[model samples]
Target: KMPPAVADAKASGIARFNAYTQYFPEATLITQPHATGHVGNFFFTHWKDGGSAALDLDAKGNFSVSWQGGGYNYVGGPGWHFGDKNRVIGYRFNQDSGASYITLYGWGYDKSMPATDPAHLVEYYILQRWTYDPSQDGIYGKTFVSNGIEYSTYRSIRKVKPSINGPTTFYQYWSKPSAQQELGKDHKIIFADHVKAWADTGWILPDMNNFDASDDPTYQVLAVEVFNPQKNGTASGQVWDETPR
Candidate 1:
């Protein structure tokens, strides 16, 4: 027997990582889950496209990328005003025909005020298709760009070719331009950074199918709980039992 849809999603994520290794030799895929409200699981494959290449599961249970870089990291969020706001920019690939789609999810944030609450902290929602391209770089697909820099929130890449066990790959590059001058120069740090930083330290990966909230000191500092749904498409339902100081 093959695998279920959830299993297929996980397998596809891994396949995306493998694809990036072939396209961008200097990049590495960093697999991690979004620990916010059982939204969905994601595997981030950082590449040299510019900043970070991400493969994320949307609310509708579809795999997509948040952003891609050609030579520079695109920056924007709910806090600092520069580029696309809270929109999602992604690339989609077709499995059967080897086609791709560059999708842009339009969203925005209010940089005029600080994020005092999760609602004001810059988020992504109301995904809409802005444009479509049938061919690019010999690949058949679509490419999407947001309106102004404040229209997008997060960005990533999605690879849908070569099958789950095939040779095709995907890549994403994420930079905390806020942490360092070179990296943070063009990037605006947001709540996403706090989540990414925690994951980077391996504080979010589940051990033996359970993540003890007590083990993480920064647990209380986060507004979300990210996890990888089982192959059955059910959440683990584990809660944060401790608080971050």
Candidate 2:
């Protein structure tokens, strides 16, 4: 059970979190009501066709998420100014029986192009863990190291898919551990390192020095995405910042 104050924080976070629906009007085939928001200092997003999620967040910003029947679709830790500062996050998953992975997920746009152009949009991921080898999916490129681990780089062209802007085609960049990553709390992700790694791998990231709203990367979230469409994609976990305040 949560303390009363913690419960209030969670409720408030959820309400605040779900209010940013303008950034996600392209979602499709989602029959159930979904929610995206923050509680305390943590942020989360829940979506699925037929499943439900039980998300709990404490006042300290630590959170636990559990879902069933394609349960948790996508949940994030916290939002941050992309590449603004070096950051570390800790995570541990008690149940992850479905296809899932923890990753830094976000979007960016090519400044040289018009916002209305599909090719100007970009979606990217820094994958930390998964139930199966993502390299088997093909489309992987050179390998790089970040946070003392080897990561395989990749880029894929998403043709006319649901994007943050709408149904559009865009380039999707990715980096995943070359080897397996285990589930545990002591495991931490170094965000700044990956930002450099991605740029070095030939992907376009927002200018770090440019915090202007026009040059800023919108909607950056350290997220856990889970799936098992048919049923029973149960998983729960906590993610917290390890960066010193």
In the range 13-82, model 2's lDDT, one tens digit per residue, is 3223333321221211212345444344343444544456544544344445555663335444444424
CA RMSD of each candidate after superposition: 19.9, 7.3
Model 2 clash pairs are: 17-37
Candidate 1: tens digits of C-alpha lDDT, residues 116-153:
32221112222221112211222111222222222222
- Candidate 1 lowest-lDDT run of ten: 216-225
Estimate every model's Cα lDDT from 0 to 1: 0.22, 0.54
Off by over 4 Å in 1: 1-25, 32-90, 95-119, 126-228, 232-245
